[PDB]
Point group: D2
Chain length 445, copies 4
Amino acid sequence: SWSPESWRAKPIQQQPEYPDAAHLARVEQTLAGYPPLVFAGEARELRRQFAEVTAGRAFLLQGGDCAESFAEFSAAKIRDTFKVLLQMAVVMTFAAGCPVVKVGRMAGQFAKPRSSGDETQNGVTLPAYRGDIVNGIGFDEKSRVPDPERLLQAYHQSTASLNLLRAFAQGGFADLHQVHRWNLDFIANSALAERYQQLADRIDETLAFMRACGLDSAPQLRETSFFTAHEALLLNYEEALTRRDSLTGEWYDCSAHMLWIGDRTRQIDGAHVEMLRGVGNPIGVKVGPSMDSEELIRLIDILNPDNDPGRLNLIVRMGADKVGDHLPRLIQAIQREGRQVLWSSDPMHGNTIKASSGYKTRDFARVLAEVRQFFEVHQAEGSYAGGIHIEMTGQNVTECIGGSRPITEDGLSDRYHTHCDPRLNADQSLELAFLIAETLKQVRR
Amino acid sequence: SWSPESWRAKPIQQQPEYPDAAHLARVEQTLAGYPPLVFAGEARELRRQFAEVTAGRAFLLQGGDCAESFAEFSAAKIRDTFKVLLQMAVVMTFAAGCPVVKVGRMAGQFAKPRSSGDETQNGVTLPAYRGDIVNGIGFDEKSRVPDPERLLQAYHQSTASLNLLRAFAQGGFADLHQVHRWNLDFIANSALAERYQQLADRIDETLAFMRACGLDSAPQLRETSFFTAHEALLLNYEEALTRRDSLTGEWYDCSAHMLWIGDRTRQIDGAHVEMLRGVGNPIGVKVGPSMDSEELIRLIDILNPDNDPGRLNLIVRMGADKVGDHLPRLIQAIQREGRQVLWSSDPMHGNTIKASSGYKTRDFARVLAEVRQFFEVHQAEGSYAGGIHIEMTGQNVTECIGGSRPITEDGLSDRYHTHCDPRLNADQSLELAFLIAETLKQVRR
Amino acid sequence: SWSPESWRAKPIQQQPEYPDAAHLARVEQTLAGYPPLVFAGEARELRRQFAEVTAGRAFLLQGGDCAESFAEFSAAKIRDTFKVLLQMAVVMTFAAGCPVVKVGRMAGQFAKPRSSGDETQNGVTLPAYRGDIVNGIGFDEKSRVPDPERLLQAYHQSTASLNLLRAFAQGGFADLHQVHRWNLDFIANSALAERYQQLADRIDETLAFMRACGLDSAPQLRETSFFTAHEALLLNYEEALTRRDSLTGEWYDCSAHMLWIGDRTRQIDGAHVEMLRGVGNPIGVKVGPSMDSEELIRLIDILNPDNDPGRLNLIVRMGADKVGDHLPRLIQAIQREGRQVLWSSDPMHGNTIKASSGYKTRDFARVLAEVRQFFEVHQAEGSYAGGIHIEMTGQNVTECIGGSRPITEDGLSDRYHTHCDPRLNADQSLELAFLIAETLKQVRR
Amino acid sequence: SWSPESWRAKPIQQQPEYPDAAHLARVEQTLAGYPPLVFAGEARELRRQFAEVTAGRAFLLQGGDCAESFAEFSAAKIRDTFKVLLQMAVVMTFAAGCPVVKVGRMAGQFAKPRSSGDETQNGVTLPAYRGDIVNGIGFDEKSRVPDPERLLQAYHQSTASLNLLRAFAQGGFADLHQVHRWNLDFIANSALAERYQQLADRIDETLAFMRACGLDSAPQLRETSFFTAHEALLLNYEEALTRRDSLTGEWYDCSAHMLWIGDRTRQIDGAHVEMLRGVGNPIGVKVGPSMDSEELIRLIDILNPDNDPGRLNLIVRMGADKVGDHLPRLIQAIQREGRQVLWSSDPMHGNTIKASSGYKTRDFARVLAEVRQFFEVHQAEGSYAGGIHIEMTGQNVTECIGGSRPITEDGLSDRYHTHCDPRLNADQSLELAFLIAETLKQVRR
Ligand SMILES: N[C@@H](Cc1ccc(O)cc1)C(=O)O
Ligand SMILES: N[C@@H](Cc1ccc(O)cc1)C(=O)O
Ligand SMILES: N[C@@H](Cc1ccc(O)cc1)C(=O)O
Ligand SMILES: N[C@@H](Cc1ccc(O)cc1)C(=O)O
Ligand SMILES: [Cl-]
Ligand SMILES: [Cl-]
Ligand SMILES: [Cl-]
Ligand SMILES: [Cl-]
Ligand SMILES: [Co+2]
Ligand SMILES: [Co+2]
Ligand SMILES: [Co+2]
Ligand SMILES: [Co+2]
């Protein structure tokens, strides 16, 4: 049996050490009485769309921030990231004839898991930066001491962001007639921009023809659903935002539509798995090179006992060099055991190079190579390459090398070469979308 | 005041001389108690679509036989002609973003007006062939004597043909997923066929995208309306099939959705105008080189006194050499007097050459030139080039010269070089449709 | 293996003796080249709706003439009969929340099976009247001698009637806003009329609310499909109108959407079964008191070998006194053998009394009692009471006794007390519809 | 010319005195960079729906809190209030055949205008309570001193509330199949509950019939738009949340879809009018007994110079005794000057009795009487009674007397008898909705 607090009896990784247990417990009670970010009905609806993807009838697009910050809390940033998602989605939808389920790493992607629990600079040692929901990026004691009030500031940033996203998605901004306005102005003067603009023209023509057929007022052309997801890492936050469905009594983590377990916190006897075990949300697990096939099946026994087809997303991040070698055996096990899973590629977290200095690089060529091999492996095994899961930005930067143009080492993107990881820019997100699109067309031909 | 028989008190052209007035009157009473081909509601609906065309928001496609015959009464022929109409319609609809109103010269286009009321072969003189509804094509007395029973045979051919057309249109045959199946198998191995096939592919993609958007079950994609029209020439037929609307009391000629007055029977004091004066149908008049602008306005005063915008179609057939010279002055008059009319081009009946032998030729190059000039003239005057009105066939023939390939002088098409006129084949209908389509796109750009 | 003519090698009942085999063969060739009444696509669509009924997700309404006549060939009669069908359909649809599949015994219900092959009046003996498609009702030699030309007159009446029905159904007459106009003016001044008028008001309110919700332009509210059916009795007619589907090569009897085998012609080794064996249409068989359960299963093996769920309608006509006793055993056999069938009640042909004089009576109370027991029997056995199959008229008569008002013995209805059977009038059809409606609501509650 | 800060140069009522101008200015800059509650596109859409109401084709329902509080910030409270709004809306929509535009006094209704700028208790005098966005209800210095940080707490409560409302409205909670679940469990055991339950049953039947017609998947049945409104009283808040539309450059107050000017702050030369003058939102003005017809027209010249038909809502709150006397002359002036306005009744703020003690009472009988007279007055003058504007709650209380049951003087509702006003409960909101509904039906009959 399970409760929202049953995770507290399990062994646990990646949790901060709060200096005042009582203070933390008061912030948790405050948050427990605040309204949920999502309504349980919607999580059920996302499960229904996951099941469509799992059965080969749609494709999952999951994208957004590496970690949202308090210092970057702007309408512009939320809008631009959502623009890139819509662009990708329409490119894939039109070229492949395939519904795309859109899920943003947004409105609650704050907590960060770290390779080390502390950090050392010239003889001074401080707790590690774990994301703004926990503590601050500044290398100094007041910054790094965990502050339970940050829970509430993360929540407030999240209701603001999701409120705006829901407005954009339902209120006209995502209407297919807006197809051109989704292109950020810095995608121009290149074969790729020309390419989007031509596809957009084709969409204009499609809608004009639908209008001439008598379908101009269909609500389906004017609005779309956008869902939210983050890593369920800080379980105090997740617990306070877990709520019983009014109609059914069943527990849902209402911090987000979908939650996932990170690669370093997926211990089968651990707290993170125990949390997600007993919520009704669609969920995901990060599947990196350390996962073997026995371990994977046991994990699925726990996270999806009834083998429901819209429950579990397996998010494969292996490295461009390792996916060929590791994935086949994992799929084969799932097929053999008759499991229903949604297979996604995270082509980014397995392709990060750390220099001795701590400076992080991601070669976009390797990101593409992992993706291409993901699809090849599915192709060979008879299973379905079901989704993509990327870190990206609508800001005019270049954080991943070996793209089309050389990188920007801005300072605005220094956070994304040290404490966070390099994100795809809009050029890169779009080229990815076109590659996915051709590949999907070929699968379905 | 007006009745279905008020035409009988007017002077009249092009009527046959029946040998037994009483016998004719009995066939007329028989036909008067038979069911109507169309229901008044539908004629009102066509008026509504005419008004859309008249206002520049749609385009009228009217096509079919020169004159239907009793010897060519086959499902195959009806289907193939309707295929060509759907092809044309979709080509225009997709490329121009414009609804097309589809009207077939079918299910009652039997009566034919003739330049002479008799015919002479080597010293023997016989009444002229006036179409199978009147008499027979054979040069012999029994054939040429008007037979009132032929009224009923025309009616029976008409209910059969329209029944089938309504079945095709509503029952799945006209569903947009059928776009490829409308291409007749003899349109192939040419840039034009390649062109239709590419447009059809674009339509497949549009529908697949609509499916992926959640619109796959829209009834608008699956069915279309098809309307019928003929020249109201034999007024005995027309009267017997004129019926009062159940709800409103108002008279409708229920032989067809739309009726038109031919160029030789449009005398303002004449029977034909008097007939159509008092029916509620959408109607048309043939406007050839002999029409002046004073005459045209008076005709419109009679045929559309209330200046209703879906009532009157002006069907301009001038000759490739004469349209430039004649049309401008006609449009200018209408504009000046504020009249609402639907302007169509009949590019065929003004471009017929009669050799001394009676053998008829139509150069397709001239057909295209009249069309191009029609649009140019509208362009120059500020008015709307609203429709096309052609004779065509889905049979694998070539009756009009100077197309892409040289003609067929079959014998199957000898009727269409003597008593009837050469029809456009499917290649020719399609090239026309593509020209119309580019022109409409340019008008609306 | 099967052909359209393979029935001619089988033993056969109820066929007329034509006096000139050659003449008959010429009329058959004429008819073979005439267009079909229906298109194969539509027959497939009706199979799809039958499958919905068979699975308990819709209800089948089949109604129309006992036998159409040449003397009663009027738009008014076709319209009024169709009005009664729409009335019944909407009453059932609204009160029961259940789609109704609408099938008219119209546009080809001409041939009649007879208890005797001749008739005797005061010493003179003549071939029996077999319906106007064969011969004439007049007791005299010229009338009664089979005339093959009557085939063509039946065909022409059929294209006229179906053309009009398709017009009504698609062209605005069947639009749900017309709900009141379907009530014939002689249903008034009674609790039953009041009842329809209230339901119609409820439908007005429903549509107004749909309009206020933004659904006013849905095509689903404006049009409906209407299908046709008759007894496939005169196989010469049926063969000439059997045609290969263009796309699939497969044979369809295109005289009508659905054909059925009568109770007296359902010999398993016989011609009628052999005809329908190899057409793709939805079909029916009349199941009267003489049918046993072994015989029924063998018949189904032949008529539906693949056990397709939209293929076969079993039309049960037992008598009010006999249904209780006979039906249970028939259903039990079907259930046991896993057969997919659409069960309908014909509550009329088993409830006819013939006086010594030949004068036919049908007590409406018995018609209702057979219906009520049909549903009771299904209720008891676990199967689905799937449809109703009645003879009815929109004319202002009373042919069945023991209704609400006493009968009309008009002369207009003397055909329906001798050579044909008494039909339900509109009062009676409606009361039936309300009973069916309550019963269906209760089944689904 | 106009800017978001141009109000600061005008004379102004009802503003608090902040103790630190600099601190306030910092909180304002913080809020200025936070995301907007609404997107400009949506405000334009609400203008479009206002225009529908103004033209007599819809009805405006505006309801919610008197003033939201920080202590009552729960999902339950937001949900229950929204339930009552949906109930009212559907009752009106179904019975009257009329679209209802739904606007909640929610997600930013914090600031309160007061009759006096201070309050005295037993010799101690303190600044008046102006709502939680300004200061605190507690009678003590720290509470009553204006705190600029409260701006941000109001904003955070607002994004949380609107995020949830948008979720409910779009995500399944407002789906018409939920009609029964909107009834709060304490509306039961009464003719009024029975009444809602019967209407809900009628809605079930309507949807079942739509399903049987093939419309079960229409998005229009599943989602609705919900808009937000408050009094634009604290202009510092409003300015910080005023933002330029991305596409058009035009300014919108993005704190809410609609803003209104209160009765005490509508000075034509004043700050409040100057603020709303130059935003693109739909807006309202409170029109109480002190407004004369000259004054009203000048106010409209300023607030709607172009006389756009979806711009201005006149919210009439006169008193049950005074509406008869005052409104006629106001309407007559508007009619005479050809102004397009949306006329609403606020039947509550003119019907409040203050005892010498400060204890506030509202007699529901008087609330109903003002409403009834509003409609009567419109009826007499030829204008349109366009909306209703009420304070209400989904909590199980009785704050207004003379309803059906005697009041609750809870303490939970003591805020609503002193600093705020008594709200309608759910019984009362519903009875109102049924009265409005009959009245609208009668107007449109
Ligand atoms: N409404 C459809 C199609 C759609 C997709 C994306 C959009 O931006 C807009 C519409 C969907 O959500 O799938
Ligand atoms: N139903 C639409 C679109 C359409 C057009 C042609 C078709 O063949 C099919 C559908 C119309 O009639 O305009
Ligand atoms: N179009 C739907 C609903 C309908 C039924 C009957 C009608 O008369 C009209 C509409 C159908 O055919 O089932
Ligand atoms: N979607 C429609 C109808 C509707 C109304 C209220 C609802 O709760 C649901 C649907 C509208 O917003 O007007
Ligand atoms: Cl699931
Ligand atoms: Cl008109
Ligand atoms: Cl089937
Ligand atoms: Cl406006
Ligand atoms: Co990362
Ligand atoms: Co011709
Ligand atoms: Co019978
Ligand atoms: Co108040």
